[PDB]
Symmetry: C2
């Protein structure tokens, strides 16, 4: 199975388009890291707001890795550290779900 | 952009392999619904357990749709209703994140 690295970000300034765009752009530029197999960035969809749906985050990220070792290499990659240095002031809260496919 | 439908399930009986497998199998069989573009089912990865990583769910699901209207068609599909009827007794809690890619 593959590894699905899912992150949801809540901005310090929710609804601030400039900060949101900066965060999105910063995430997308991580495509420079060759261990990332897929890189998707998103925002809440206009789906029916059901009780079980959390639409309160501002930006979502989905990366796919071949393995836990490749994800580890991403984690330790200088370009990811630069992104956190550049962009972590933008967010107040993050939730990460790392899943291995079955 | 595409629609990423992400669901995390916590089992009533966490760690019960039989229930987990039943849930996984039930999710995978939703491939019968033609509006689903991709269907991935997983469990927590053995990634480094960081404070921001929630590894407490038992089963994860990722579906991709072309549009909010296609997701709506999935939502209303009899085969999804059958899955909920068949399998909802297995889980105690669900969290859903519906993201549109940007």
């Amino acid at each position: 199975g593959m590894l699905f690295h899912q992150v949801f970000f809540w901005l310090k300034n929710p609804g601030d388009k400039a900060d949101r765009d900066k965060l999105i752009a910063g995430l997308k530029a991580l495509k420079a890291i060759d261990v990332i197999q897929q890189l998707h960035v998103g925002v809440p969809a206009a789906t029916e707001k059901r009780d079980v749906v959390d639409n309160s985050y501002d930006v979502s990220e989905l990366m796919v890795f071949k393995s836990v070792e490749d994800q580890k290499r991403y984690r330790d990659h200088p370009l990811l550290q630069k992104f956190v240095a550049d962009c972590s002031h933008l967010w107040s809260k993050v939730v990460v779900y790392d899943s291995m496919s079955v």
